[PDB]
Design a protein around this nucleic acid. Structure first.
Ligand SMILES: [Zn+2]
Lengths: 125, 134, 136, 94, 38
RNA sequence: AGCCAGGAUGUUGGCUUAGAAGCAGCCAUCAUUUAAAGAAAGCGUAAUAGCUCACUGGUCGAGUCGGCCUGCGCGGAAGA
C-alpha cells in the first residue's frame, strides 16, 4: 500500500515534473495491454515524454501546483498523463494515433498555456 | 498466435514442432523450411525463438527473433549447459563486452531504455543460470 | 524416552501437586511453551511432543526441554487384590504446576514457532500457552 | 519518555495487595538513595502497555505522586505465573 | 458430510455458518469440505 | 467488500526430462517497461494453451481489520 509519506513524496514528484514540463495531455488508460503500454513508453522515452498513471485526488494536490488547475475536472475517470518535458506536442500527436491505432480508451482533455483544450481541438497540439 | 524455440537450421520432428502449431491449422513444411531459410544464419546448436502469427485463413506470418538470453549466455561463456545450482554452483564466464553483444542482439529483442537496461536484463539471465560476469 | 539413569530409591510416595511453578521465564530460547493448567507429564507425552515440534521446524533452530520426568509411578496389574506390597514401577512422570515452561525454542521465525507449539501441545494433557522471553 | 501516575499506599500486606489486584491496580515500590522507601499503587493497564516496549527497562522514567515527580529506573519485576499480568515492580531511585 | 466435533476451513473458499444452531462449513469449490458439527 | 480495467519483457531463467514453457522435480529468483505485475498463490496441458490470485488505476463513499483480557451462552453429549 501507500503511506501518507508515500503519497506526499509522489505528489512532490508529479508537481516537480509538472513545473518543469512545457505541455501535458490527460487520457483514459483503461482496456489496454501492458505490451502496447510499454510500446507507448518506448515511443515515450524516444519523444522525450514523461508517462504516468497517477491517483486522482493525488493529482488535484499536485496540479494545485499550477498552472494546470483547469484539468481538475479531467481527473474523473482513470488518469494517464503525458508530460512532454522536451518539446511541447509529441504527446498530443502520439496519443491520438495510439488511441486510433488501438481504438480503445479516450484521450479526454489537454492543457497548454494555462488553459484546457476540449477533445476534438487537441489537434491544435 | 503461438510461440516456440527451434534449433538453428532445423525443423519438422514430431514431438517439438509439428503437433504444437499443427493443431492450429498451420501448414507445417512452409514454416519448417522458410524458418531454416531465415535461420540458416543462426549458429548450429542454438535454439532461436520464433513467434508464429496465424490468421482465420491459415496463412501465417512469423517473426523469428534473436536467440534467448540463456542460449547467447551458454555460447558467450563457452559452455553447453548452465548450472543446476545457479550462483551456488557457477558454470562459466562473460566479460561486459559479451553482456553488451548479447544485449545488442536483445537490444533488437528487449523492452529496455538503454543498452545498460538490456545489459542488465542479460545480467539478470546471467545470474539465473549461474554464470559469472567477468 | 527420558528416565533417570540411576536413583536413590526405586519407588515413591504419590505426593501431591500443589502451589505454583518455578522457572516461569524463558532463559535460553526466544520463545517457550508455558503450562497454564496443572498435571502430570509422562515421559511418553514429552517425547511424542518433542517429536511433533521437531518435525515442525524441519530440524532447524533449537529446542530445549526444561522438564524432566523424575518421579516413578507404579501399577498393580489386573486381577490382583489389595496389599501384598506396593505395585511395580510402570513409568515415569514430571509434576507440572501452573506456569512451568515445558519447552524453549529459538533460531526460528515467530509465526513458525507458534505453529510448532500448537502441534506440540496437541500431544499434551494440560492447558498451555505461547510466551516470549523478556528483558528483565 | 514514560510518565507513570501513582498514589501512595495507605495499606499493606497480602490482603491489601490482593484487593489492589482485584481492582485492576497493582502495588510497586520506590527505594534506593538517601531517602526512605515509598510504596505506591499503579494502573495495571497503562504500565502493562508501557513495559510492552523495551526501553522501559533501560531508561530513566518519571513517577507522578501527589503532584511530585520522582525519577527512577526499573529494577526487577515479578509477573503472575501464567497470566499476561504484573504482580509487582521494584523501582530504584535514579 | 464430515460430521465431527472440530470443524475447520480447509481452504480459502470454505465459509463457516451457523444454521439452526449447528455450526457447518460450506464450500463452493470442494464438496469434500462440507461439514457439520456433531 | 462489490463492480470496470490491466496482471507486462528478457524468457520456454538454468538444471532435468520423450515433454517442465510461473505451476513433476532441483537450484537460483535477477533485471527491464512500470500505476502495478511473485522467474508466480491455485485449476489446467503429453508439454503448451486456457482460468483466477498476489499487485495496481478507476467507480464507491465512512468507518474497517484481528489479536489480547474477561462476563453469560452454543456444539462436543448414546441405553435399556
Ligand atoms: Zn474448501
Amino acid at each position: 500500500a501507500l503511506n501518507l509519506q508515500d503519497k506526499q513524496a509522489i505528489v512532490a514528484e508529479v508537481s516537480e515534473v509538472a513545473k518543469g514540463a512545457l505541455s501535458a495531455v490527460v487520457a483514459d488508460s483503461r482496456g489496454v495491454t501492458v505490451d502496447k503500454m510499454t510500446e507507448l513508453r518506448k515511443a515515450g522515452r524516444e519523444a522525450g515524454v514523461y508517462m504516468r498513471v497517477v491517483r486522482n485526488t493525488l493529482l488535484r494536490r499536485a496540479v494545485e501546483g499550477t498552472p494546470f488547475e483547469c484539468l481538475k475536472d479531467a481527473f474523473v475517470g482513470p488518469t494517464l498523463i503525458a508530460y512532454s518535458m522536451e518539446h511541447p506536442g509529441a504527446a498530443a500527436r502520439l496519443f491520438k494515433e495510439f488511441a486510433k491505432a488501438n481504438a480503445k480508451f479516450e484521450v479526454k482533455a489537454a492543457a497548454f498555456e494555462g488553459e484546457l483544450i476540449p477533445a476534438s481541438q487537441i489537434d491544435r497540439l | 498466435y503461438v510461440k516456440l524455440q527451434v534449433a538453428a537450421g532445423m525443423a519438422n520432428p514430431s514431438p517439438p514442432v509439428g503437433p504444437a502449431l499443427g493443431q492450429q491449422g498451420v501448414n507445417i513444411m512452409e514454416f519448417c523450411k522458410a524458418f531454416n531459410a531465415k535461420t540458416d544464419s543462426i549458429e548450429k546448436g542454438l535454439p532461436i525463438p520464433v513467434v508464429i502469427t496465424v490468421y482465420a485463413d491459415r496463412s501465417f506470418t512469423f517473426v523469428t527473433k534473436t536467440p534467448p538470453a540463456a542460449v547467447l549466455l551458454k555460447k558467450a561463456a563457452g559452455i553447453k549447459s548452465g548450472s543446476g545450482k545457479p550462483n551456488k554452483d557457477k558454470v562459466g564466464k562473460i566479460s561486459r563486452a559479451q553482456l553488451q553483444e548479447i544485449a545488442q542482439t536483445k537490444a533488437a529483442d528487449m523492452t529496455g531504455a538503454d543498452i545498460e537496461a538490456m545489459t542488465r536484463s542479460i545480467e539478470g539471465t546471467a545470474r539465473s543460470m549461474g554464470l559469472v560476469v567477468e | 524416552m527420558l528416565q533417570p539413569k540411576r536413583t536413590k530409591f526405586r519407588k515413591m510416595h504419590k505426593g501431591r501437586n500443589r502451589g505454583l511453578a518455578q522457572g516461569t521465564d524463558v532463559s535460553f530460547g526466544s520463545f517457550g511453551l508455558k503450562a497454564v493448567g496443572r498435571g502430570r507429564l509422562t515421559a511418553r507425552q514429552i517425547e511424542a511432543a518433542r517429536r511433533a515440534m521437531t518435525r515442525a521446524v524441519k530440524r532447524q533452530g533449537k529446542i530445549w526441554i526444561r522438564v524432566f520426568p523424575d518421579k516413578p509411578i507404579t501399577e498393580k496389574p489386573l486381577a490382583v487384590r489389595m496389599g501384598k506390597g506396593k505395585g511395580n514401577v510402570e513409568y515415569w512422570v514430571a509434576l507440572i504446576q501452573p506456569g512451568k515452561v515445558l519447552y524453549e525454542m529459538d533460531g526460528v521465525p515467530e509465526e513458525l514457532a507458534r505453529e510448532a507449539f500448537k502441534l506440540a501441545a496437541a500431544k499434551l494433557p494440560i492447558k498451555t500457552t505461547f510466551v516470549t522471553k523478556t528483558v528483565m | 519518555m514514560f510518565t507513570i501516575n501513582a498514589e501512595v499506599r495507605k495499606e499493606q500486606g497480602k490482603g491489601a495487595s490482593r484487593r489492589l489486584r482485584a481492582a485492576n491496580k497493582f502495588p510497586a515500590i520506590i527505594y534506593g538513595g538517601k531517602e526512605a522507601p515509598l510504596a505506591i499503587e499503579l494502573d495495571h493497564d497503562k504500565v502493562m502497555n508501557m513495559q510492552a516496549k523495551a526501553e522501559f527497562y533501560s531508561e530513566v522514567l518519571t513517577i507522578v505522586v501527589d503532584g511530585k515527580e520522582i525519577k527512577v529506573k526499573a529494577q526487577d519485576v515479578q509477573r503472575h505465573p501464567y497470566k499476561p499480568k504484573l504482580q509487582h515492580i521494584d523501582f530504584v531511585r535514579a | 458430510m464430515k460430521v465431527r466435533a472440530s470443524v475447520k476451513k480447509l481452504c480459502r473458499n470454505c465459509k463457516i455458518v451457523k444454521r439452526d444452531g449447528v455450526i457447518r462449513v460450506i464450500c463452493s469449490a470442494e464438496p469434500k469440505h462440507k461439514q457439520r458439527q456433531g
